[PDB]
Amino acid sequence: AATSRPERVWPDGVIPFVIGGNFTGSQRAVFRQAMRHWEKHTCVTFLERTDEDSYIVFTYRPCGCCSYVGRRGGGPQAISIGKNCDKFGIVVHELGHVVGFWHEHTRPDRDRHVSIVRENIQPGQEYNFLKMEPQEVESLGETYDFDSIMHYARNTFSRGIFLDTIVPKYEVNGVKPPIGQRTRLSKGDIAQARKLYKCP
Ligand SMILES: CCCCC[C@H](CC(=O)NO)C(=O)N1[C@@H]2CC[C@@H](C2)[C@H]1C(=O)Nc1nccnc1OC
Numbered sequence: 243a244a245t246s247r248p249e250r251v252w253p254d255g256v257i258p259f260v261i262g263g264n265f266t267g268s269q270r271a272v273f274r275q276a277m278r279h280w281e282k283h284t285c286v287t288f289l290e291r292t293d294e295d296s297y298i299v300f301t302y303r304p305c306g307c308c309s310y311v312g313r314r315g316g317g318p319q320a321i322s323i324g325k326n327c328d329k330f331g332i333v334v335h336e337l338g339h340v341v342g343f344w345h346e347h348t349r350p351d352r353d354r355h356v357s358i359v360r361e362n363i364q365p366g367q368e369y370n371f372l373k374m375e376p377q378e379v380e381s382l383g384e385t386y387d388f389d390s391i392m393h394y395a396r397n398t399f400s401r402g403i404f405l406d407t408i409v410p411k412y413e414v415n416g417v418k419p420p421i422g423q424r425t426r427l428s429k430g431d432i433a434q435a436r437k438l439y440k441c442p
Pocket residue numbers: 306307308309310311335336339343344345
């Protein structure tokens with residue numbers, strides 16, 4: 243679910259950043275490792291903000307709302323990192339939003355790949371499962387990526403842990419594909435991020 247809008251793509255893949263106060267050194271290191279992880283596999287670059295108008299701010303506060311997708315422009319944009327969402331893979335997911343990725347399960351073509359079990363979604367959280375309107379996303383020829391760092395888990399926003407909200411529609415190499423990994427950027431995430439930033 244890569245943004246269709248070329249203005250939300252960060253110029254030359256250069257994202258200026260600021261790590262805010264109230265983080266431990268250990269937490270600061272995790273942010274750095276996450277940014278490096280994006281730098282390693284793609285042509286995107288994270289640089290300490292000096293006098294730029296556009297930059298990301300790692301901000302110590304409760305998890306959740308909200309992570310701007312792509313370059314907002316004309317000011318800073320925050321990444322909320324709290325006690326329960328400070329791990330490497332979650333930060334990599336958040337930086338996935340920064341570069342310009344929506345959630346994978348909201349791709350305009352997602353109904354061919356996953357079923358959404360509406361009855362199991364927490365009341366009031368159903369909007370998190372709405373498809374992106376087709377004018378907001380361009381997949382760049384890349385297939386639906388079940389392994390994406392941007393893909394929800396099977397029971398994200400579920401009424402209970404043993405109730406699925408998202409069920410993959412078909413088998414992939416013998417079995418229903420696992421979804422919701424927060425370990426590392428997928429082959430698909432990299433391949434698609436390389437396309438979005440025209441990397442060599
Ligand atoms: C339950 C509370 C709302 C959840 C908000 C998600 C959190 C997320 O996915 N973190 O990784 C978010 O921030 N989102 C959704 C996923 C990409 C988009 C939609 C992002 C968002 O809301 N972005 C913004 N949209 C409009 C204005 N400002 C935004 O971010 C600052």
